[PDB]
Design a protein around this ligand. Sequence first.
Ligand SMILES: Nc1ncnc2c1ncn2[C@@H]1O[C@H](CSCC[C@H](N)C(=O)O)[C@@H](O)[C@H]1O
Ligand SMILES: Nc1ncnc2c1ncn2[C@@H]1O[C@H](CSCC[C@H](N)C(=O)O)[C@@H](O)[C@H]1O
Ligand SMILES: Nc1ncnc2c1ncn2[C@@H]1O[C@H](CSCC[C@H](N)C(=O)O)[C@@H](O)[C@H]1O
Ligand SMILES: [Mg+2]
Ligand SMILES: [Mg+2]
Ligand SMILES: [Mg+2]
Ligand SMILES: [Zn+2]
Ligand SMILES: [Zn+2]
Ligand SMILES: [Zn+2]
Lengths: 437, 437, 437
Amino acid sequence: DPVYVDIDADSAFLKALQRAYPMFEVEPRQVTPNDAANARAFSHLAIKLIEQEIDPDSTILDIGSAPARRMMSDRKYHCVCPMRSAEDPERLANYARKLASAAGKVLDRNISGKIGDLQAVMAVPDTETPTFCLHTDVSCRQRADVAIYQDVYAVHAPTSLYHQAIKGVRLAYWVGFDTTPFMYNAMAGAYPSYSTNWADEQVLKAKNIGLCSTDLTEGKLEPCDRVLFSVGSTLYPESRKLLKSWHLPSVFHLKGKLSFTCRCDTVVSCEGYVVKRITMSPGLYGKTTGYAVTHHADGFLMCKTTDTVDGERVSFSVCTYVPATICDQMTGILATEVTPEDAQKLLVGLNNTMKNYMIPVVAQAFSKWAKECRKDMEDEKLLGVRERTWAFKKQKTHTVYKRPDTQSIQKVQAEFDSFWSSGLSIPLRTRIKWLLS
Amino acid sequence: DPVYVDIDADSAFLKALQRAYPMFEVEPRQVTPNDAANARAFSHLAIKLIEQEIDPDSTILDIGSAPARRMMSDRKYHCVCPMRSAEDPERLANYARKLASAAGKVLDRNISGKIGDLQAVMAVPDTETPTFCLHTDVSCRQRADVAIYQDVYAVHAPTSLYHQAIKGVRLAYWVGFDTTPFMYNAMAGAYPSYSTNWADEQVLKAKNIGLCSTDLTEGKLEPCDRVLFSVGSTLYPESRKLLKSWHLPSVFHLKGKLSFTCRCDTVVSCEGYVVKRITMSPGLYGKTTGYAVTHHADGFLMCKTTDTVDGERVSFSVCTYVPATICDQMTGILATEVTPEDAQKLLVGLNNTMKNYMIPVVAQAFSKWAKECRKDMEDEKLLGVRERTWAFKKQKTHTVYKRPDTQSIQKVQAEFDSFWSSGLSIPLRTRIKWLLS
Amino acid sequence: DPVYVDIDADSAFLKALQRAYPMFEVEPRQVTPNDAANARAFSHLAIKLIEQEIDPDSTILDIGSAPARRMMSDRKYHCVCPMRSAEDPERLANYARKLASAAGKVLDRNISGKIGDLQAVMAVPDTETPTFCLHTDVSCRQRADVAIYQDVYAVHAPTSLYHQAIKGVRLAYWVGFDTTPFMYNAMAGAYPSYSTNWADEQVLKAKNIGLCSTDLTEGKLEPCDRVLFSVGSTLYPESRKLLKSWHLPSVFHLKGKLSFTCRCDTVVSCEGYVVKRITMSPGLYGKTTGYAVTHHADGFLMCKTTDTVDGERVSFSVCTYVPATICDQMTGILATEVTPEDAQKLLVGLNNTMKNYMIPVVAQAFSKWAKECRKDMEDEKLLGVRERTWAFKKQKTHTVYKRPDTQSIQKVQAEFDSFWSSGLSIPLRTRIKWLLS
Ligand SMILES: Nc1ncnc2c1ncn2[C@@H]1O[C@H](CSCC[C@H](N)C(=O)O)[C@@H](O)[C@H]1O
Ligand SMILES: Nc1ncnc2c1ncn2[C@@H]1O[C@H](CSCC[C@H](N)C(=O)O)[C@@H](O)[C@H]1O
Ligand SMILES: Nc1ncnc2c1ncn2[C@@H]1O[C@H](CSCC[C@H](N)C(=O)O)[C@@H](O)[C@H]1O
Ligand SMILES: [Mg+2]
Ligand SMILES: [Mg+2]
Ligand SMILES: [Mg+2]
Ligand SMILES: [Zn+2]
Ligand SMILES: [Zn+2]
Ligand SMILES: [Zn+2]
């Protein structure tokens, strides 16, 4: 009945987890000093919930999978496992090792069948087995009804979903980080509850952001495609286009040789991690608007800041998340004009609910926001009238602040109409064959 | 005997629910983290009360229905289900799935008959069955005596009611959001107890309203038909004309080939959600005035505010709801002239009874209202006399404030005299047929 | 023995009810969220008391009745039910439905006879039965000895009473709102204990009265016949002439072909609701004066106020009721001159005994009254002398204040000498016939 997570029994994250999964009983049982524990716990609980949702005797496609995670499960999984990243051979070797280790002690699972399928794929690499294949998402021939994406950021979402749908899949899930900070086009940012920082490749030599490094000395800039992610002490390169492609609107159409109508919604949300549910049906129905909405339970901040990159002083924008209680407790102070130092002292007085290294920039954002409010109250126009004497002036905005219980809305695309080699090596196949034997 | 609702046991909304349904026993039993829970609970209790009102052995038309909600009920429902929105195929598939799942475990309900009717409609799409059809409201041929509208905002009320009445219906119900803010012709607004914000399509790029999104930068306007609604994180487009059409007067006439006299009244009201009861009788009787009345148990505010839309500074009107206790506790302060900052500090001191993101604009409205009162006391006219020396000046009004235990009144129309394709697809029909089997 | 009322067990109104009916035991038993509960409770208790007064085996005429209210009573009622308003067909249908529902379960009442009379009237509409007819008050042929008017404001009182008296009626009762504010000729007013506001048709676009509605903008008047009443959220149009006609003097004469001497007195009075008892006797006796008296247990206020109607600033008079304890506690302050703001703060300090939305205007009235007193003390005349040098000046009066334990007196008329179609439809008759069967 209860679910066990590998975090310390005194952490404050546990509270939040119990709020996000009220249908479970969460128990802390710590065994490793892992520095990316919270993300692992969230993914574990998400998979538990998804399994509890769908009915048995349904085959499930696992896109970009690590097979060792699905061994002790009683459901039917077909793992789609190409070898495109540098961490895949180790995952395959670990899977083979774990399969060999427990060969007669566990009998309620299809262990012998799994070994047979692995050996068959090793012998001939272009064959589909009930539990394994070596193709990509757009070339696997297996037919199923459910698909799952877990921490997959390297595919174009509409094309992948269309190729999943033309094979009879009616339900899909997606687990990963929230894509909202990338629709605002920021330079760098943090997910502080998960110990995650990310930065654009051009500001890696800054001084006072989460992920940077610089030296000692005596004495156009716009976002690009390539981004670096750091979860704990693990590094991942990412692309802005593919991250943006997963920010889907509420309803959309897929129009090719066959046609489908699909809808997407968010079912779990905890401080930056989300779970998305997508349903697809045959035929065209209704009409689309092209808007995507995000609900904010915490505060979301984006602001402009000044730093030195490689010794040269520049300015760019950063984003972060703020707990709701602090935002509620700062309501009265922001009615006047306040300097950044006083705001910093007040925030330190209220605070650990939030990480300290993020405080100095937050205090700089609030101070600006309040000021921009006062000016609005002092230059009051007339109702239903615009002045455009033919040019009109644009005011300056240095801060965007989405308070708890508000919503963001953005215009995206909603109509889509436009949409092999083994890669393995002889020594790796021989090693796997010997490991199984 | 008791009724269970899917909200947390510590929420303050529960209190209000117990005040709106004093004939029930409300128990919290939370199973999902749904962010639109309060609206669902209100709708659930409303349906329970309506069922407890009318007598059994009466057939009930369900206009624009989701059939899966009526499966486990012992009453007789005829669901009118066209496919005009993009969320309908999924609802139909869910209905078929739920019907198939419980086929022999539940025997007190007409499960087998429901399956037979669904299969018959799938085989031929232009046939009426006792529990299902695929026509619209003005083309269904079934005869009944009660009709129900649940969260239906996309029909013209007099025409629909006339077509319901010429078929022998004598009673109707309507559940939805209050239409008063749209008779005042506001730009944007909030229902804060239900986590709902709405805005006109022209101000979606503002900065400091509930539903908007903007960017960072260095540097005639009147309401239109199209409106956007956001309930939790679900988005709905709406039209002002159809929303306004449901704000009916106390008595009205329907004059066509046959004639009817009808009357409408509000029976449940909780912070923005209402239940309306309409009765229709044959023949013409009495005479009409054309007025509609709203009773305010909380405070209702409408005020003018200044913002920047896409960088350009403009002014427009917003509306909101205020709890009665705060309004009662602000009576003494508003006897003098008060600045917005002092009002903001006082409101924060009194406050969480109300959401904080709504406070800064409320504090701006009160401050103006009080000032407009003082001027009235300082320019006193004579009894029963008007000055029109031929033009007379009009004063300026920046705030409308309806205090608890007051009433709004508005002039509307009260005399009405002026009032098909399957749309389904072969793959969807085949999928439903296979799902049932 | 005890009487049950549909109000909440914590309301302060209950106290007052127990003071008005000391011969009963009042118990709260709340079942509906009705917003006009207090008026319903008062009417219920009034009917109980009237029934307890008169002796049995007397037939009672019920003028302008709703028959469903008299079904479960053991007395003999003859209901006079024309169809002149738009709410009558629904009342008739409800009566028929309730009659059909309990046809064999209740046997101590003349249920079968009631059904027979209803069917007979349906068959032929111009016949009198022991319990039903379709005529007006001046055309019913039934003979009785008691008549009852319950919330009837649409008849001319002397003519109706004469036509009741020429048929052998010797006693009559009247239940309704107090008519005193209409003999003072006010523009608008409130009954705050019953959640009732009323206004003249010409000031429906004001801003700061109980019943009004206005908009946002940048920039002879005398009372007329038509008035609007709002009880909770129910709207009723009324005429000033017919309301005034029910303010009868202590003794009066009816002189026609036959002659009668009648007298009227008030027997129950609670914060605006009254019960009146009228007795009529054959022949002419005594002589009349033509005065009507009202006793005040609470404070009654009438004052001049300034507002904006449709944007134009005007002045008119409003009236209200004030609890006796507040009036007693303001005696010492009103010995000097006091500003409206100080009076508002003092009233808020004393106050919830009274509704807050009525406070700002009350504070404005008191402040004026006190001032008008000081001037009187500073311009002192001689005993038994008038100055009329031939014109005399008239002073200005802006407030009328009737304190508790005082009496109003007014001159009215006391000598009176000057005093049909079915209207039903075939479909309604058929519907009633089918409902009974
Ligand atoms: N086009 C494609 N189709 C299917 N899988 C792909 C793919 N491109 C990359 N991948 C795989 O996606 C994986 C992302 S790493 C994610 C691994 C796994 N989901 C986990 O939870 O750890 C990589 O191993 C890569 O091999
Ligand atoms: N003219 C019409 N007649 C009948 N139904 C209509 C209609 N126009 C739209 N509808 C239906 O009304 C529905 C509104 S969505 C409401 C669904 C349901 N009442 C619920 O509680 O969830 C849509 O599914 C749409 O199919
Ligand atoms: N001239 C007349 N003679 C008798 N009844 C009349 C009348 N004019 C109007 N009425 C009736 O008086 C009623 C007033 S509404 C009052 C209904 C009832 N007394 C109650 O307590 O609810 C209307 O239904 C109308 O039909
Ligand atoms: Mg690791
Ligand atoms: Mg939902
Ligand atoms: Mg009513
Ligand atoms: Zn495969
Ligand atoms: Zn039908
Ligand atoms: Zn009669």
